[PDB]
Amino acid sequence: VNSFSGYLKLTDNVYIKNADIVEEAKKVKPTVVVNAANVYLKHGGGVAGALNKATNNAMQVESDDYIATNGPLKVGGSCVLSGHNLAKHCLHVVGPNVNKGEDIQLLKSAYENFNQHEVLLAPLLSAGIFGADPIHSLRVCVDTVRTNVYLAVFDKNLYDKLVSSFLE
């Protein structure tokens, strides 16, 4: 029902909250939840692991069937699959993993996938163990996405740093 609450409004279409994306998906039941995926859709850890565990592995089984028939995605690409019990759809988006030497310029392409959906619940792409500068990821989101994006960032110090940096 896209009933988001407790978000700071950064711009006319970008919102942010200190929260676990899985708990937000359970509360809101959004039309679209974004997964911070990798090209073979192996949802073992981080955000992807948390979303998969909350579907009791249904997301991993569906992703394996997709990969068997279609092969891996490309960095900057995306795939709409079922949202299972968390949302109507899950938009699996592959941002660059700069810790594994992938090109940071593809982060704009990764965020461009969001523009196909009027409203989305999403994590901060390529942050955490993917190694992108999270302040830069927030700026790319703000400059690229025109649809309504509700960012859930599950770390108080990072959330505070992002808000302070944006408001400078």
Ligand SMILES: CC(C)[C@H](Nc1ncnc2[nH]c(-c3ccc4cncn4c3)cc12)c1ccc2c(c1)S(=O)(=O)CCC2
């Ligand atoms: C910067 C981080 C604070 C942020 N983390 C998160 N942001 C939003 N919701 C989250 N839930 C959990 C979580 C993790 C275990 C777990 C176990 N039971 C419940 N859980 C929930 C983590 C998480 C973040 C954002 C983007 C990326 C990553 C991490 S990554 O390291 O997975 C690589 C892909 C890109």
